[PDB]
Write a protein that binds this ligand. Sequence first.
Ligand SMILES: CC(=O)N[C@@H]1[C@@H](O)[C@H](O)[C@@H](CO)O[C@@H]1O
Length: 601
Amino acid sequence: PPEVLPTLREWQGGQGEFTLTDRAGIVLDGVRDSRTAADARRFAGELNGKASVSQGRAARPGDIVLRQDPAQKGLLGAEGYRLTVGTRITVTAATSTGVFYGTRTVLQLLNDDGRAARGSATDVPAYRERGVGVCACYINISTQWFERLMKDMASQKLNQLWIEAKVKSDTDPASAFWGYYTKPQVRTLVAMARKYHIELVPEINSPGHMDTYLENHPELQLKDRDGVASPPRLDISRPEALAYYTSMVDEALKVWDSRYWHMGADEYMIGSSYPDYPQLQAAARAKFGASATPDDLFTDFINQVNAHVKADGRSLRIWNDGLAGKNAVVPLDRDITVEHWLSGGSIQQPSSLLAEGRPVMNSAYSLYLVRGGFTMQTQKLYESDWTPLRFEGQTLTQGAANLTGAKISLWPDSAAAETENEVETKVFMPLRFVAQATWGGPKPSPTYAGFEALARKIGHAPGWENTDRTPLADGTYRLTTGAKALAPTADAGVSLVKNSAASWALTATADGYYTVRSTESGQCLDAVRGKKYLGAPLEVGAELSLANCSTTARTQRWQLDTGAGALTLRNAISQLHLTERASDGAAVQTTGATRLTARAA
Ligand SMILES: CC(=O)N[C@@H]1[C@@H](O)[C@H](O)[C@@H](CO)O[C@@H]1O
């Protein structure tokens, strides 16, 4: 079988080889489809040489034929294709997506030497949800980084991107504090996902983990028997609580424009806490009788969100850990997808969830990457023959129609411990592994070493890189705006100082940033002031400063964002830019930027 990733579901080999010559063309000989044609024009360019795209002439030996035939939808589904490698290559699919995935395989087949052994496959995914999740909460993850991830996902036939993030709110401006995405930024991500055949699954977590929204709304916070508020927890016994959350959901769904909504619902309450929340107890018993629990009120709240989003043709998803068999009266609505990440205690088992007839996704903790914490051990998973049947706590003995797939999940828990560019490096093999496990073809090799070699040979998606990480040669520069230059000032501060001749040693790092070191003091430009979340300096307005250079301080790493006349400096961790403070000229971090001209010194 061919060395492609994910591997083909089957392969019937033949004799001979297809070879790409400068005579080859790309032939679209099915239905007219502008998306398929645009994708095909990119594909034609991603091959060596100069292939033209046509949709009027018959195919010929040596051509790559892309045949979109909607009548094949029953056989091939929305994402499958039929590949023939002969004297010509033929990809037959029912949809633009299926043709695209076929062309991902073709690129890999021709990568090494423009030749491919002959044969054929019907290649259809074993699972319908093949995912990566990124938690872009507290911190901000750049849109350029997301575009690169989407290209890489698409190149490996992954089709689902979960994003937990705050949208800068017009509905509730008191929640609009960094990190967030603007509505234009969200629409940019939406456009990217559509282009790369990826479904976005946005999340605002509720009714736990709401500290990023409830900080300025103490009236909505859950109180215990002692009267003590839990800042991250919404009081679901208050009607104003559901109204608040569904408002924020509505505002986010308008811009994300996704079919799915993920409301989270992880880490809200456990039964050992029930003596301390008699008001949730009371509210539950009032509604659902003498056996009802706080978990019944929780499940009901989720079902209410379900009804809300279903009214606008959307579908709901949650994490699994709040399903612990204590909802005595109120079952979770069956058309809510449950993403299983955690087992233990009385948490409901995968088998039990699947037996209930709901969609269940495997989002195992084992598939997590956590800044400063656990890293998915792809080698071990490969060596132990991990598949989506292997949930935390339980391995299923057979498949199920309602097991949707799996995803890897990226979390920022110790947010200053690792840059997004370092996470990008770390996720390379996880991404290929979950793509392989969910597409569902046979292993290319018994052991991991062969898989890894193949993955690294293929490398990133064609067109992956979307930035220039090293726009300045390493050296000493003055950084100027008008009459001012960046310079050291009082109390380890840095400012834009009129008529200053100060200069800085800029040196690229291995992870796509620069250190910025004062030629005067020898100290490094850093972000260590202001409010921290998850250990990271995320306050807009916080002053920048100088500190002893450190190889481990990720807050000393700066991204150079380029223009023709000037550049801006973005902190790797905070994702805010160096900005001049008007009152005193101090360099501070904000969502704007001061444009600086680099002048060799
Ligand atoms: C769904 C999920 O992973 N929930 C939480 C996550 O919110 C948090 O970052 C982590 C801290 O260790 O605990 C759990 O993993």
